[PDB]
Amino acid sequence: GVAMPGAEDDVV
Amino acid sequence: EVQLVESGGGLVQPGRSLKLSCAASGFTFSNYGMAWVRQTPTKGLEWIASISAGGDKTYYGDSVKGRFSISRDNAKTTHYLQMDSLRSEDTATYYCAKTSRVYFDYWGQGVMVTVSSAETTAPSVYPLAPSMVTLGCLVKGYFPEPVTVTWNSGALSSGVHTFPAVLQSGLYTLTSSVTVPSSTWSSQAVTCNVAHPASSTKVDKKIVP
Amino acid sequence: QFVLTQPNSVSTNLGSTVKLSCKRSTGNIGSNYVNWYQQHEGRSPTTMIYRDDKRPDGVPDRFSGSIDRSSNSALLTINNVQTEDEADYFCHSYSSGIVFGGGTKLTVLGQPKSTPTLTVFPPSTEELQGNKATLVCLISDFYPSDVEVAWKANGAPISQGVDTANPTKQGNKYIASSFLRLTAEQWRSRNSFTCQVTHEGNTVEKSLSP
């Protein structure tokens, strides 16, 4: 699934 | 052990600014985004803003029309919410929350922000005296929440009940109690320790027979 | 960009299965993950379910998540519900923005009835010195949580000056408090006040006298 706004660069 | 420790809340006048801090530790701070979310009984949880793992991308929610801005200092491993032009309706508990791509994996402890032109009011503290015995501390007429109450600096922890406050004519009143063996009361001092963080006041009351 | 609607409250019984729903107003519920957070009284949220149906280690296996596309809703199912599961439960999803449901408060009946204990305190000499008097009634150790609190002066019901707090859970049971605001003279005047509490049809009372 696509990341939530702001969380797209979280490592896992 | 993930820890998110918030500070900077309290009472603020309308139209004034406040900046909340969220000190993170117990995980690699720079590998994860962070968000701020506020809570009220009437509006539930509202997302305010998020900032990405590298601190370079920010996202704002529509609940606040840009008056709040989010930043981070990765060397202090701390996140911040700068709240400008505050309004009565911004009164809330503010949380920071760590992200893990698709959900909020940990939440801070929350801090209360009260936006009001009413004065801070410090409580009046009164001792309540009456085999076990129950002693109490009446914490009368303060604003805003919260207050903390301990007994013998926390050395009396079992037997303690701090009761939810009532609100009347704009001021809160609560009572806290502790139950001890009557042999304790007759041979040891028992003191309640009342702290009202928003007025920076601290009161001790010894409960005397 | 969408709303998530949750019931305000569900009341269930110890050992039952209970399903808490979270319905997406527009767009498919299945189009992004849904998560669930538990929030106890006065505490921070913690994760119950993430990524629709995954359970953090440490969350009891009686919690499970699912997605019901026919009603466009996510579901938190708690089997063999326990009184420690009383809490507010929030669902969470996202698309271009981040959205929370409004929270469902879960009440669990069916533990052994516990009748309240009463403690009453008269006004303190320090308070009377200022000509005011607050009578304190502390109500504790009761389950389940509704109580009716009434004050008497000389055996007659007195309403004016009374403030009673809503019960709150602390530990395994509920506590509540009630206050009677008096002037120094009103307290000195009569020779008895009574805090009376009714709980599950049982009544306990205690009195205060100068």
Long-range CB contact pairs, C38-44, < 8 A, 24+: C38/C85, C38/C87, C38/C88, C38/C89, C39/C87, C39/C88, C39/C89, C39/C90, C39/C103, C40/C87, C40/C88, C40/C169, C41/C87, C41/C168, C41/C169, C42/C168, C44/B95, C44/B107, C44/B108, C44/B109, C44/B110
Residue contact A7–B31, C-beta within 8 A:
no
- What are the distances in angstroms from CA C39 to CA B19, C82, C99, C140? 25, 15, 17, 23
Segments making up each domain of chain C, as ranges:
2-110, 111-210
Determine the structural domain holding residue B47 and report its residue range: 1-117
As given in the structure block, the two tokens for residue B137 are 């501390």
Which of B117, B135, B151 is the C-terminal boundary of a domain?
A: B117
Bridging pattern class, strands C73-78 and C63-68: antiparallel
Q: Are residues B132 and B183 in the same domain?
A: yes
* Residue B154, number of CB atoms within 10 A of its CB: 9
Q: How was this structure determined?
A: X-ray
Instruction: Tell me if the domain spanning C2-110 has CATH number 1.25.40.10.
Output: no
Instruction: Read off the CATH number of the domain in which B178 is found.
Output: 2.60.40.10
Helix (DSSP H) and strand (DSSP E) numbers for chain C: 2, 19
> In a 3-state reduction of DSSP, which class is residue C61?
coil
- What are the distances in angstroms from CA B118 to CA B88, C46, C52? 11, 34, 45
- What are the distances in angstroms from CA A4 to CA B95, B132, C11, C94, C134? 18, 55, 33, 6, 52
Taking the CA of residue C95 and the nearest CA in chain A, the distance in Å comes to 7
As given in the structure block, the two tokens for residue C10 are 């569900």
Q: Are residues B3 and B92 in the same domain?
A: yes
Q: Give the contacts of C121 (CB within 8 A, at least 6 positions apart).
A: B128, B129, B130, B136, B138, B175, C135, C136, C138, C208
Cis peptide before C7 (omega within 30 of 0): no
- What are the distances in angstroms from CA B18 to CA B68, B78, B115, B171, C132? 10, 16, 10, 23, 38
Q: How far apart are CA B71 and CA B110, in angstroms?
A: 18
Q: Are residues B172 and B69 in the same domain?
A: no
Q: How far apart are CA C151 and CA C118, in angstroms?
A: 13
Closest residue in B to C170 (Cα) is: B161
Same fold, C2-110 and C111-210: yes
- What are the distances in angstroms from CA C162 to CA B108, B146, B167, C135? 37, 22, 11, 9
Q: How far apart are CA C188 and CA C127, in angstroms?
A: 13
Query: Looking up tokens 């063996």, which residue turns up?
Result: B181
Q: Are residues B190 and B109 in the same domain?
A: no
As given in the structure block, the two tokens for residue C181 are 């605001």
Task: For residue C179, give the nearest of B124, B161, B173 by CB distance.
Answer: B173
Bridging pattern class, strands C87-94 and C98-100: antiparallel
Bridging pattern class, strands C104-109 and C9-13: parallel
Q: Are residues B72 and B130 in the same domain?
A: no
- What are the distances in angstroms from CA B138 to CA B112, C103, C137? 23, 33, 11
Q: How far apart are CA C40 and CA B132, in angstroms?
A: 30
Q: Are residues B180 and B135 in the same domain?
A: yes
Q: Are residues B110 and B141 in the same domain?
A: no
Q: Kindly list the residues from chain C whose CB atom is less than 8 angstroms away from the CB atom of residue A1.
A: 32-33, 51
Q: Kindly list the residues from chain B whose CB atom is less than 8 angstroms away from the CB atom of residue A5.
A: 50, 59
Task: For residue B110, give the nearest of C44, C51, C101 by CB distance.
Answer: C44
Q: Are residues B17 and B89 in the same domain?
A: yes
As given in the structure block, the two tokens for residue B156 are 């009396």
Q: Kindly list the residues from chain C whose CB atom is less than 8 angstroms away from the CB atom of residue A2.
A: 32
Q: By CB neighbour count within 10 A (0-12 exposed, 13-18 middle, 19+ buried), where does C120 fall?
A: buried
Which of B74, B93, B117 is the C-terminal boundary of a domain?
A: B117
Q: How far apart are CA B134 and CA B128, in angstroms?
A: 9
Q: Name residue B148's amino acid.
A: T
Which of B65, B89, B117 is the C-terminal boundary of a domain?
A: B117
For every residue of C179-210, which 3-state class applies, written as one string? Answer: EEEEEHHHHHHCCCEEEEEEECCEEEEEEECC
Listed resolution, Å: 1.6
DSSP class of C128: H
8 A C-beta contact, residue B94 and residue C24: no
Q: Are residues B97 and B49 in the same domain?
A: yes
For residue C121, which of B148, B136, A5, B84 has the smallest C-alpha distance? B136
Instruction: Tell me if the domain spanning C111-210 has CATH number 3.40.190.150.
Output: no
Q: Are residues B199 and B176 in the same domain?
A: yes
* Residue C105, number of CB atoms within 10 A of its CB: 17
**Number of structural domains chain B divides into:** 2
Angle at B72 between CA B91 and CA C50, to 5 degrees: 75
Inter-chain contacts counted by CB atoms under 8 A, chains A and B? 49
DSSP class of C118: E
DSSP class of C48: E
Angle at B185 between CA B180 and CA B188, to 5 degrees: 110
